[PDB]
Design a protein around this ligand. Structure first.
Ligand SMILES: CCCCCCCCCCCCCCCCCC(=O)O[C@@H](COC(=O)CCCCCCC)COP(=O)(O)OCCN
Ligand SMILES: CCCCCCCCCCCCCCCCCC(=O)O[C@@H](COC(=O)CCCCCCC)COP(=O)(O)OCCN
Ligand SMILES: CC(C)CCC[C@@H](C)[C@H]1CC[C@H]2[C@@H]3CC=C4C[C@@H](OC(=O)CCC(=O)O)CC[C@]4(C)[C@H]3CC[C@]12C
Ligand SMILES: CC(C)CCC[C@@H](C)[C@H]1CC[C@H]2[C@@H]3CC=C4C[C@@H](OC(=O)CCC(=O)O)CC[C@]4(C)[C@H]3CC[C@]12C
Ligand SMILES: CC(C)CCC[C@@H](C)[C@H]1CC[C@H]2[C@@H]3CC=C4C[C@@H](OC(=O)CCC(=O)O)CC[C@]4(C)[C@H]3CC[C@]12C
Ligand SMILES: CCCCCCCCCC(=O)O[C@@H](C)COP(=O)(O)OCC[N+](C)(C)C
Ligand SMILES: N#Cc1ccc(O[C@@H]2c3ccccc3C[C@H]2N2CCC[C@@H](N)C2)cc1
Lengths: 290, 99
């Protein structure tokens, strides 16, 4: 009768999230100071099994995480067929919570199919050379394919681990000192979503304009900026935080016309972004005394 | 600012564990020694508040560009989130001085 009260129910639901975060921390606890399994090395630990056997096998802590995610998917489907699939998408945090579970499910599916391929190939080979169906396995991380499911799972698990820390927003407005901070932090994301439109207009403008300038100098440039659309995207994205050098507008030829055009366009980009961010800061300072 | 450091260390611990889990298996096959130990992933995200952490700390030497693009996206989202949190702190402290 105590555990059916609302406050003990809240305490139990917060404790079962503290446990999940503790599992996510202590899962990678053998590698806190170095993994001791090099990307070029090979460790079998049984002298009769493949290397790709003791990499995709599930531990005793990677099954509890699967049980938590299965219960967390079931507790979301029960919310879907009780509030209705139209009033459930009305809050965007439900979509932010559904994407995390979808990414966790995709990660565990990819790891399971990697383990399934490893077991299907290890059933054949139950020292010497191996045939061309087991030869891809028992190989270190340097020789894997770029689309191996073992590196799809390890890539999606990181996004899932980052996104699962955002469920503190469900237990944080019950407090008298971090509730108003969450309210005042949420009201300043809706104030920058309207300035990101002009931000991406100026961004797309200078991205296409400098890609059109430095496209023909792909091998004759000081580095690899402004030559591909993704390179021109990241060179202008990391210049907001000052992490893009001025050596990214220099070419190796004697065409100083194009280099001076690039210098002028990069300077105008930096000045324009400073003006836009200062206008955003002043507008958000002004829309808090209202 | 003692009350905003709590949300600051929530976002910090989130991205620290999330990027340590990504770049853990590439300890010798990476451009530098970031995001491989917990102290390296801690200091790479601490010194990125002051802009003293380069973008070459998310680059691996292999042809696994999936994991490298995940690291690029996570580092960019970390920088944008910290800019939002610090700007919200500055605006809140400007507002709680005319009261
Ligand atoms: C939302 C409002 C946006 C307003 C944007 C205005 C901000 C203007 C920023 C100026 C950017 C300068 C960048 C400096 C880097 C290097 C410049 C450089 O190499 O100089 C050019 C200078 O060329 C120009 O004509 C600069 C004109 C810039 C006008 C920009 C106005 C939008 C080369 O000419 P020179 O080498 O002096 O000539 C040979 C003499 N020995
Ligand atoms: C508190 C609020 C926080 C809001 C956070 C939102 C801020 C979003 C920042 C964007 C970060 C981008 C970093 C840029 C660095 C390099 C990006 C890169 O390498 O591109 C990825 C782009 O991949 C994506 O899908 C980007 C999606 C990012 C969405 C983030 C939303 C949270 C690779 O794909 P690709 O090379 O275009 O594909 C091959 C085509 N030739
Ligand atoms: C393992 C590492 C990654 C750290 C894991 C994080 C947790 C240990 C922390 C972070 C957020 C904390 C919570 C933030 C807010 C609250 C509300 C608080 O309740 C009240 O303020 C009064 C209740 C009322 O009167 O309504 C009880 C503690 C609790 C759940 C905290 C419990 C401990 C939490 C889960
Ligand atoms: C918004 C409206 C008013 C139009 C924009 C103003 C233009 C009339 C200005 C702004 C940028 C200027 C350009 C910036 C840089 C260059 C490179 C410069 O080339 C060299 O420095 C020669 C190098 C060498 O061979 O030694 C010649 C002038 C030029 C084209 C400038 C020409 C005049 C421009 C187009
Ligand atoms: C908050 C909720 C709404 C969920 C978050 C949104 C996701 C649906 C987005 C955000 C980050 C995106 C990822 C960022 C980077 C990558 C790497 C990219 O891989 C490559 O570029 C291939 C490289 C090569 O081999 O050439 C594939 C897409 C992917 C996984 C993206 C998949 C879709 C993601 C997970
Ligand atoms: C990806 C980064 C991970 C970092 C984790 C930090 C968690 C802090 C959450 C937080 O401050 O929420 C802000 C966005 C306000 O949300 P809202 O717009 O008030 O919406 C709250 C609605 N509710 C149903 C969740 C209560
Ligand atoms: N009786 C009761 C009860 C239990 C839980 C509850 O909120 C859940 C919760 C509690 C602590 C920490 C994180 C989360 C996530 C919240 N979850 C609920 C369903 C939809 C899903 N998108 C989000 C509300 C009411």
């Amino acid at each position: 009768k105590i555990m059916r009260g609302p406050f003990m129910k809240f305490v139990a639901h917060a404790a079962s999230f503290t446990i999940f975060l503790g599992l996510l921390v202590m899962n990678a606890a053998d590698r806190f100071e170095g993994t001791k399994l090099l990307p070029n090395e090979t460790s079998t630990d049984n002298a009769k099994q493949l290397f790709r056997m003791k990499t995709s096998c599930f531990s005793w802590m990677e099954m509890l995480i699967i049980s938590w995610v299965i219960g967390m998917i079931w507790a979301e489907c029960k919310e879907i067929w009780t509030q209705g699939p139209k009033e459930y998408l009305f809050e965007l945090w439900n979509m932010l919570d559904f994407g995390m579970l979808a990414i966790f499910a995709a990660s565990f599916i990819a790891r399971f199919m990697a383990f399934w391929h490893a077991s299907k190939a290890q059933s054949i080979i139950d020292k010497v050379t191996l045939g061309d169906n087991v030869k891809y396995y028992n190989l270190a991380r340097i020789k894997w394919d770029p689309s191996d499911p073992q590196i799809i799972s390890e890539g999606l698990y990181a996004i899932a681990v980052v996104l699962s820390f955002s469920r503190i927003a469900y237990i944080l407005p019950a407090n008298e000192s971090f509730g108003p901070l969450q309210i005042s932090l949420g009201r300043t994301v809706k104030d920058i979503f309207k300035f990101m439109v002009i931000f991406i207009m100026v961004f797309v403008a200078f991205m296409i304009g400098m890609f059109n300038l430095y496209s023909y100098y792909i091998g004759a440039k000081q580095n690899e900026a402004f030559t591909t659309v993704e390179e021109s995207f990241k060179t202008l994205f990391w210049a907001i935080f000052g992490l893009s050098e001025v050596k990214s507008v220099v070419i190796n030829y004697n065409h100083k016309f194009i280099e001076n055009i690039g210098y002028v366009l990069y300077g105008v980009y930096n000045v324009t972004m400073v003006i836009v961010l200062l206008n955003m800061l002043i507008a958000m300072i002004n829309s808090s005394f209202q």
